[PDB]
Amino acid sequence: IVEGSDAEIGMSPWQVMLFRKSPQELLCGASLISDRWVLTAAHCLLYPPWDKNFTENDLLVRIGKHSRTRYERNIEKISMLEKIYIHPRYNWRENLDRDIALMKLKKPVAFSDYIHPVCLPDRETAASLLQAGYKGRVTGWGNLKETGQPSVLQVVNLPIVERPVCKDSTRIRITDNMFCAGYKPDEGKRGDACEGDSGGPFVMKSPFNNRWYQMGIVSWGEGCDRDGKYGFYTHVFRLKKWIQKVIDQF
């Protein structure tokens, strides 16, 4: 996260770190959506242009974390993956359309003060909240700058941007399964995700029921925190039929 701040303790208890094995490194962010299911970006697991093709045994899920590098004894929980499910129409060839994947854990994680699931939006949540100017919150342990790394989880609040402005900021084809967020150059304020933050949550706190909903998944940006550029997020509600289908079957 660029131009964010340190998370408060227990601020984002659905935050998940995807942690690679051999070699021990940050793979991506992710989020806890139930005691057995973790949501992330498909490109965190499968991205052939970068020779990324992770299988279940390559990765661990670390939940309840605050410090990036420390093993947070008695706080964090470390989970093995049972199965990865990537959207069958995930477009890695082109523009990361439907950048979404699910991971089922081998064992249910116990909830705690530091470990707690986020809600997924229904149609009404999306319709009420996914509006230009409404702010969400992005969290992760990714890079502090485009070109270093944080001691603890970083947080930034960013406004959703009008679809035409999103489209006009890039040469990439922007689909209805994506939205963009971040400040404009004349807005003064700054902030973005960066390398290592993909797969993490873009969340909003419903003012109707005072619950946090994951509206987006951190997907991609052209660099990080560049003037006139925005972050692009997977539209979780638009892909919820797929989410529901996978959880119902498996």
Binding site: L120, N157, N210, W212
Partner: peptide
């Protein structure tokens, strides 16, 4: 049933330092 309610925040009726920024944007 308890999704999206944080043990150290909503569950205790405590607010984090910047959630008001989000609420103020929901116009």
């Amino acid at each position: 049933a308890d999704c999206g309610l944080r043990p150290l925040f909503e569950k205790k009726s405590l607010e984090d330092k910047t959630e008001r920024e989000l609420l103020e944007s929901y116009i």
